[PDB]
Amino acid sequence: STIEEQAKTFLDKFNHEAEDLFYQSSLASWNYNTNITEENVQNMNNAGDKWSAFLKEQSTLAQMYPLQEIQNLTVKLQLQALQQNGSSVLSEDKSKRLNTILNTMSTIYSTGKVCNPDNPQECLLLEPGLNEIMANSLDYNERLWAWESWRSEVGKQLRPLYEEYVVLKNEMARANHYEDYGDYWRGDYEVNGVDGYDYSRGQLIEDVEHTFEEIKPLYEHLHAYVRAKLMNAYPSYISPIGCLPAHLLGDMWGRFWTNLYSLTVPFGQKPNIDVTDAMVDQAWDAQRIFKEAEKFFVSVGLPNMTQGFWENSMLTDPGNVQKAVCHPTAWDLGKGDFRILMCTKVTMDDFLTAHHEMGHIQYDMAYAAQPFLLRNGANEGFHEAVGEIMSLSAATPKHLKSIGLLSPDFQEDNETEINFLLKQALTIVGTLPFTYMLEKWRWMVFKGEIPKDQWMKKWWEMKREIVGVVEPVPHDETYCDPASLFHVSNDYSFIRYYTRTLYQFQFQEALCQAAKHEGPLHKCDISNSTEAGQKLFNMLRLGKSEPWTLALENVVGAKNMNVRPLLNYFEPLFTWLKDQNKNSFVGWSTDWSPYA
Amino acid sequence: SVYAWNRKRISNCVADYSVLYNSASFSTFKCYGVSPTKLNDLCFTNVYADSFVIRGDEVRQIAPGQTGNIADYNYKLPDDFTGCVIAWNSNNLDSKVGGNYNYLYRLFRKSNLKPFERDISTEIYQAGSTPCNGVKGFNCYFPLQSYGFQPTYGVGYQPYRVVVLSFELLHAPATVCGPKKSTNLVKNKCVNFNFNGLTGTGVLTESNKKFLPFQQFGRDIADTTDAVRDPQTLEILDITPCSFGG
Ligand SMILES: *[C@@H]1O[C@H](CO)[C@@H](O[C@@H]2O[C@H](CO)[C@@H](O)[C@H](O)[C@H]2NC(C)=O)[C@H](O)[C@H]1NC(C)=O
Ligand SMILES: *[C@@H]1O[C@H](CO)[C@@H](O)[C@H](O)[C@H]1NC(C)=O
């Protein structure tokens, strides 16, 4: 009895209900997010349980098919996900214990409460408050206390939960023909198809760190510069040869360093990129802002925006009685339905965010012809990269002048461009090393190569060299810095955030390479460039049908992951900072500490 | 439905194809065996109407030399087909906010459907070698699935009404044809006339003779038409050749 032919019939039968049920779930989710009420809460579970229980019997049927002789590559790829039962590899008691431990780990993070010692009844939460205390302020005592409270009252109580969760997740991952659990995460960055484009998880492990050594001169100098400027900002706090504490980063974890851009502005007399008066003068409401951005999208060459989006989507504020979230989201409910949910405001940052959301909409509708299991990005790092490419391309002063927003007699020159590039770099190259060290730490925690005593004392003694942030205070292993993060309690992969921006720059270079645009890469624009669309078009329509290894061939000739544009995009800031840090010795000596 | 596409026989009447062609509410109206301009000029014995509501994407699938989930199993159209099909949006009529589930389409069929053939069987489809007693199992499936038309469904997915017009040329007398041209009656001038194929030139006057209630036209001797009854007011005219001479 043939198996190859009946596999297609099983796939079609599964899909015919899969798209329908996913559409129902998406419509219910959009209804709940648009307007919240008690009725619109229980129905969410009433649909989610059905959707989840639909995923169990289809995979149950996906074991009698002998997935070893099916010759069709598409069919084999589609049934590969079918054999993935999910959490049905361990006992029911272990499964429910893992679910409970995940739920309690999330809830403990959701109930963070730290009060000021002087007033025992005045606690602050993740909402604007203690997070803002060390975000925008010039102090060293309140920031120190706030960080101490965050790192002691959050993470230490979650320690045993993470201890059990790590081993439980590793054990359940082992039962799925996996040497670890991180291998399952790396499975997205893995292909077992055509020869010459094949990829392995260890290949990802090595290639994610061979792409890190080429930014050492770009980073260390910046660190010294920051340190140097910190010397003019915070005298007699840090040795000129040492490294800065985590309090002065500007964030609870120091991921984004743009908060110090205004503090460390070289030329404060020169105004930044401001168009707020231009936005408000001629009444740029949400609809016409979105329409001008859509005009830019059309100028790129993207297909016409679908009719009915202006109707179903709720562009403006939700209102007063109809509560709704303000998270910028672009919903693709399926069956030709697209909507957006944002609390719109007249800001340039929201302009870029709207560009990002509409880029996501365009990428989502790009692969609409895919089967139900292939309407996803070829990897995690394309959706966000595609969205942020439009944001990067919408900030150039050339396009802003083209839309009648800046004065025609403006005086853009090297100084203001360097200032803007420093602002950009504090957000762009301000996240690479901390993200890399966090992901590496998670990886060998998953692997288990480090014992139960070399977990927290190793974290800081390796952060000292990977990034260069001194231990502000002594600590023991009972602390747990990584557990006080968004993507550690919900089991969210963080490697996407590393390559993502790189992809942008690669595209931001590659498209510029196919743009006939002369000058700096930051000033390179793809507006009024039809040729910049079709190259992208050759990949957006691919979806998950083709592996990302071959997908990264219609835009960039090189199929490998080499960090070319980081040394190409930030050339003038780096060559000016080399002049800036002539006397200040770069690097940090990992011997100086506030306590010693 | 589409797997159970209705068949209607239209004959012994006149077809108003002009009002069908000029209407702008029809989403799709394309055909090649007959150009729509001259369709009213020449006519056939009778016509077949097939009405069903389909998804917008599948609309292009109904054409000669086409294969698909509908073009091969729900309906097969022979390559030598003449005539064409009218499609128009019906999302606000056929669909409902709760989701229209009243339309079904055949998805599986052991044998590909024959041209101008409708199969209404609902046999439990079998794929694998497992012995199935009409019960779902490992690889024993169902040949029919449902449409889920919703108002929020995007273009190409909304319920579109589709009427197929099948034209046939049996040796029996043709019945359905096109309309007239009427013009206007003019008298006392040498003109030419085409009274129901009574083509000829002359001058038309008023007469006094009386036809029995069933004649159509008269003649006098040597088989030359001499009087005609107009098909509108049922009055007896007369025919005289406009003069000539040396
Ligand atoms: C076809 O011809 C005309 C078209 O309307 C109709 O007959 C005349 O109709 C008008 C008004 O519609 C009347 O004032 C005349 O008295 C009618 N005359 C005759 C002779 O009927 C009618 O629809 C049709 N008439 C016939 C004879 O078939
Ligand atoms: C997109 O559709 C709108 C709505 O009909 C139309 O006005 C516009 O010209 C179209 N643009 C393109 C590029 O197709």
Residue to substitute in A296, A304, A310 for testing ligand 2 pocket (most ligand atoms within 8 angstroms of CB): A304
Report the DSSP beta bridge partners of residue B198: B195
Strand residue runs (E) in A238-373 = 244-245, 329-334, 337-341
- A291 alpha carbon – ligand 2 mean position (Å): 12
Closest CA to A359 of A393, A317, A334: A393
If you count them, how many residues does chain B have? 246
Judge: A13–B153 Cβ closer than 8 Å, yes or no.
Answer: no
Q: What share of chain A is helix, strand, coil (3-state, %, to 5)?
A: 50, 5, 45
Strand pairing class (A244-245; A469-470) = parallel
Please tell me the residue having the least CA distance from ligand 2 atom 2: A304
Q: How many helices (H) and strands (E) does chain A have?
A: 25, 6
Of A6, A20, A333, the CB nearest to B127: A6
Helix (H, G, I), strand (E, B) or coil at B125: strand
**Distance of alpha carbon A521 from alpha carbon A571, whole angstroms:** 9
Q: Is A487 part of the annotated catalytic residue set?
A: yes
Residue with tokens 């598409």: A74
Report the DSSP beta bridge partners of residue B30: B85
Strand pairing class (B125-126; B85-89) = unpaired
Report whether A497 belongs to an annotated binding site: yes
Residues A177-215: b if buried by 16+ CB within 10 A, e if exposed: ebebbbbbbbbbbbbeeeeebebebeebbebbeebbeeb
Distances (CA, A) of A91 to A165, A171, A172: 15, 11, 9
If you count them, how many residues does chain A have? 596
Write down the H helix ranges in A477-588. Answer: 486-489, 496-513, 531-540, 548-551, 566-569, 571-580
* Sign of the dihedral through C-alpha A454, A495, A551, A81: positive
**Distance of alpha carbon A494 from alpha carbon A487, whole angstroms:** 7
Report whether A517 belongs to an annotated binding site: no
End-to-end CA distance of chain A: 76
**DSSP class per residue in A144-160:** HHHHHHHHHHSSSTTHH
CA atoms within 13 A on the CB side of A147: 24
Q: How many helices (H) and strands (E) does chain B have?
A: 2, 14
Virtual torsion, Cα A427, A230, A435, A522, nearest 10 deg: 30
Of A1, A13, A333, the CB nearest to B129: A1
**Distance of alpha carbon A135 from alpha carbon A147, whole angstroms:** 11
Judge: B153–A9 Cβ closer than 8 Å, yes or no.
Answer: no
* Sign of the dihedral through C-alpha A567, A573, A576, A577: negative
Measured from the Cβ of residue A45, the count of other Cβ atoms closer than 10 Å reads 9
Any atom of ligand 1 within 6 Å of the Cβ of B172: no
Helix (H, G, I), strand (E, B) or coil at B160: strand
Q: Is residue B175 within 8 Å of residue B12, measured between CB atoms?
A: yes
**Distance of alpha carbon A281 from alpha carbon A284, whole angstroms:** 8
**Distance of alpha carbon A162 from alpha carbon A99, whole angstroms:** 13
The structure tokens listed for A532 are: 């910049």
Report whether A384 belongs to an annotated binding site: yes
Judge: A9–B127 Cβ closer than 8 Å, yes or no.
Answer: yes
CA distance B153 to chain A (A): 5
**Distance of alpha carbon B64 from alpha carbon B82, whole angstroms:** 9
**Distance of alpha carbon A596 from alpha carbon B21, whole angstroms:** 91
CA distance A350 to chain B (A): 28
Spell out the SS3 assignment of A25-45: HHHHHHHHHHCCCCHHHHHHH
Distances (CA, A) of A22 to A19, A126, B25: 5, 32, 33
The structure tokens listed for B70 are: 């509908």
Please tell me the residue having the least CA distance from ligand 2 atom 5: A307
Residue with tokens 């297909």: A303
Helix (H, G, I), strand (E, B) or coil at A507: helix
- Residues of chain B neighbouring A338 (CB-CB closer than 8 A): 154
Of A1, A6, A336, the CB nearest to B153: A336
- Residues of chain B neighbouring A336 (CB-CB closer than 8 A): 153-157
Closest CA to A367 of A352, A355, A382, A354: A382
Q: Which residues contact A88 (CB under 8 A, 6 or more apart)?
A: A56, A59, A95
User: Solved how?
Assistant: cryo-EM
Q: Is residue A191 within 8 Å of residue A197, measured between CB atoms?
A: yes
**Distance of alpha carbon A590 from alpha carbon A586, whole angstroms:** 13
The resolution in Å comes to: 3.1
Chain A residues 89-108 with CB within 8 Å of chain B: none
Closest CA to A20 of B205, B150, B181, B232: B150
End-to-end CA distance of chain B: 74
Q: Long-range CB contacts (< 8 A, 24+ apart) of B128-132?
A: B128/A1, B128/A6, B129/A1
Q: Is residue A54 within 8 Å of residue A17, measured between CB atoms?
A: yes
Judge: B153–A335 Cβ closer than 8 Å, yes or no.
Answer: yes
Please tell me the residue having the least CA distance from ligand 2 atom 3: A304
The structure tokens listed for B236 are: 């007896």
Write down the H helix ranges in A243-338. Answer: 276-281, 286-300, 309-312
Helix (H, G, I), strand (E, B) or coil at B210: coil
Distances (CA, A) of A377 to A21, A331, A416, B231: 21, 15, 37, 73
The structure tokens listed for A421 are: 């590039």
**Distance of alpha carbon A43 from alpha carbon A50, whole angstroms:** 11
